[PDB]
Design a protein around this ligand. Sequence first.
Ligand code: FE
Ligand code: FE
Ligand code: FE
Ligand code: FE
Ligand code: FE
Ligand code: FE
Ligand code: MG
Ligand code: MG
Ligand code: MG
Ligand code: MG
Ligand code: MG
Ligand code: MG
Ligand code: MG
Ligand code: MG
Ligand code: MG
Lengths: 172, 173, 172, 172, 172, 172
Amino acid sequence: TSQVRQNYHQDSEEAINRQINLELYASYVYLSMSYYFDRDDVALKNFACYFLHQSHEERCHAEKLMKLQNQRGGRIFLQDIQKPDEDDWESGLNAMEEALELEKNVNQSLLELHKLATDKNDPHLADFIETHYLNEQVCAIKELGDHVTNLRKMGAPESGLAEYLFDKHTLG
Amino acid sequence: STSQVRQNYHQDSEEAINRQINLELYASYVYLSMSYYFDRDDVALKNFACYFLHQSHEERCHAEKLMKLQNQRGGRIFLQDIQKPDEDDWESGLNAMEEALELEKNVNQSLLELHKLATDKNDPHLADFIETHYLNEQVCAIKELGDHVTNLRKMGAPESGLAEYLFDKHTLG
Amino acid sequence: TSQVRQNYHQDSEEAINRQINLELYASYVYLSMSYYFDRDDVALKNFACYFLHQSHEERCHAEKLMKLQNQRGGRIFLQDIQKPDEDDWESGLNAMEEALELEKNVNQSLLELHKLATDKNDPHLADFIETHYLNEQVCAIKELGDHVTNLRKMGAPESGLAEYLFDKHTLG
Amino acid sequence: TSQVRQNYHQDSEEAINRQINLELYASYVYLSMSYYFDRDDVALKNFACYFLHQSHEERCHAEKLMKLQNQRGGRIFLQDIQKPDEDDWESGLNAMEEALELEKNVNQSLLELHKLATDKNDPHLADFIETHYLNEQVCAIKELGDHVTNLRKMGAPESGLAEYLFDKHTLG
Amino acid sequence: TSQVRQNYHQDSEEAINRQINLELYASYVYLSMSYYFDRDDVALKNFACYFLHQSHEERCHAEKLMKLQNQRGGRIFLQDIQKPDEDDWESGLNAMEEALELEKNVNQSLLELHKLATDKNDPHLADFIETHYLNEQVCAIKELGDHVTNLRKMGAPESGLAEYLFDKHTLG
Amino acid sequence: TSQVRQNYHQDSEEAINRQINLELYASYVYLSMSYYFDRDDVALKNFACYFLHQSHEERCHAEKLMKLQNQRGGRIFLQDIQKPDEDDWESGLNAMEEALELEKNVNQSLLELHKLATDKNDPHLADFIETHYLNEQVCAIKELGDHVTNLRKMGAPESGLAEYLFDKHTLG
Ligand SMILES: [Fe+3]
Ligand SMILES: [Fe+3]
Ligand SMILES: [Fe+3]
Ligand SMILES: [Fe+3]
Ligand SMILES: [Fe+3]
Ligand SMILES: [Fe+3]
Ligand SMILES: [Mg+2]
Ligand SMILES: [Mg+2]
Ligand SMILES: [Mg+2]
Ligand SMILES: [Mg+2]
Ligand SMILES: [Mg+2]
Ligand SMILES: [Mg+2]
Ligand SMILES: [Mg+2]
Ligand SMILES: [Mg+2]
Ligand SMILES: [Mg+2]
């Protein structure tokens, strides 16, 4: 047992290792979307920049959980980072819809982690999840919803003009 | 199916670039694992942790630049799973530096094979890209890791915990 | 023989004279495109500025090759600069497609020059072409591909609105 | 007919296309002369810089006529740019004498262009040629005459000392 | 075998040790030339300064090859540095002609070293020689041929006035 | 006989040429030591930096003597620079002991040169050696003795820890 470990359930330690993997997985999905928009036959530079920024933020989300595992005296066990479900993300609107679904899936995992921390009477871990993850998730999900709504109302994805102008005026 | 930009870019080179993107992401993940080993309360060498986190971010840059190259030449990125590292516990500062040295020589071997493929397919843009952005970076990385291994061994690591502590402070700090 | 000449094949010297001509030709094509977009019945000022910049860069490409010829002790022999294939470039989209074909033709010529340098064991000339020309050509072709993709997706050339907005938001 | 065209004779439009060709020809002659002086067996760097500057100014002279053609509603028709009459310009003095001759030939063309504008009652074109071209030519011809006079008095082209000192003290 | 050594042929290691000696020999030749021009019976201070600068640059060329040898895991074996072929360099023109011959001999040795790197499939060593040495050699050879041409055209070495004015106006 | 020469014995001239050689020799020993410490299997960067700075200072000692030879109207005759006695300097302590022996040998040569200047009644040369060389040698020998003492007392060369900490805290 770590000399630092106090009130830190084995189930919590294991759940943090699963969440670390899911944040790295989210980083990889965003990295894939980024370079889709960099293709010469897609060529939406601000979509590319937006998703690359998201990719770097997900890596920070993972690193902060690795720091938490060590702060609580848990042991990090990394797993393979699975490749994203798509190679071709089809359109700006479809990438934003896939990102929205990804962020709600990550949020569901964080809410299960919070329930576990509550069930094991771990108020430090509950507070860490509320403070650093749950509001960030609600803000990310609201921003992706707003982007989806605008792209739909503009006529995406059938209007290439719509995706071009969204790229310039919202993401640029 | 052929990109409007594609010129003198062999399908074998496009595939070799997808394999190299995977290996650079792999190397990033190895260095991330090493970084958080040294952050453990029972290891607690912060400058080793910082050194390997910096290496992790640089390997991510190496991957992103190859993804940019793929699209520049009109090839198509196909990502694969990023395999977890061979170890969870890296044992010591010396053992982590020896594992990083082996990793960097394995990455360099892959880059030399990619350069040979660019040469055999008469792709001088790709040959130049690999020489300019990867091959001297690898030779510099391998020489630094060799220098670090030598100093740790000469100081008495890994048995001398005093050695790794003082190396952490005076070389990596 | 020049007092500076060393390891510089006659074939290489001749191929550098043909490349000087091709860079001046490319400069002239872009000058013609530039002033097409300046016509009162075309009036896309950022297309004009974009192609005039490209024309000035091709002149620089020519001058640097003339400098190389003298550095290696070859002798510059200039040839007529042929006028471009069109007087009327039709549309923003058509000029960009014509520029993309021109840059791929210039790249083919540079790759033949690199092969000749390699075949004559001229590592100085190989390196010169790689360092100053081959990566510039890859960047130029990618940028022109991106521009063609955006114009097509926006509905060019039939949409005069598409060419107007592209002129403003991408080239402006 | 262009919606902008007013008081612009077809002959004047055709004369401006001929003058664009002649300005681009002059630019090419000066570029040739520049890289002659850069040869390892000539090696007068301030002659080289002087002539390259003159090359770049002639390109500006051509672009300004292209702008004028579009301003008046005429249509630009480019022609091949003929290579210069020499590959080897022989000496600093001979280059300066050939430049003087070239500038007097361009001046003669500009004076015929002015007579045409006067004969067609085109005072805008007459003014444009007087304002932008005729005093520049008189200044250029006077400077080239001054340079020829000094190189001759100094002992050029037989004195290699003369050309070296002129390069340093007048052109440097 | 060094723990760093990878794809580095013994022949390449030995060729690098030979090139280190040749760069140190070139440094020594230029040091000799420098102090010939500092003699009270020669007294061309800018020739002295020019050659001493060339001497310090050759020392940098040697040091960078010593670094390369250790970077690749090869072992530096230093050899005697042979004194230059002359004690008395006769004139400014003669020193410049000897320097041009020296820089072409060093270039031939670097081209041989590049061929060896190519034959041993050592692209890192090939790129190192092209990046740091081959273009520097072409620039040095072009500069020395320019200097020889000017001194000859001015009347050197028989004109002590020529060498005096070249020392002031080109090297000062 | 040089027009500047006064009270400058042939024996003094010859001794100055021998001292120039010895200073160049010392520069080469320190260069060799420098790149020994840069080897991947030695890797003491501050030892490397220390010895390279010494190498550059010995070069300055040789150049100032060449200047003196010319100031006095003597004639420089350069000799081969012999390679150092070792390729492998074994340890930081062994390198410092070898440097101490070298500096005492150079000092002995300078003391014999001073005796020559005294025996030939050359007060200018006597003062030159005292002012520029003898106090510098005393300072270099004391510094090297202090470094040898500290390395021995720390437990070098058997303690790799000693040489590491000396590199950081004394040379760094
Ligand atoms: Fe996240
Ligand atoms: Fe990498
Ligand atoms: Fe070009
Ligand atoms: Fe003009
Ligand atoms: Fe050199
Ligand atoms: Fe000394
Ligand atoms: Mg985010
Ligand atoms: Mg797996
Ligand atoms: Mg690295
Ligand atoms: Mg361009
Ligand atoms: Mg013709
Ligand atoms: Mg002018
Ligand atoms: Mg190559
Ligand atoms: Mg010293
Ligand atoms: Mg000898």
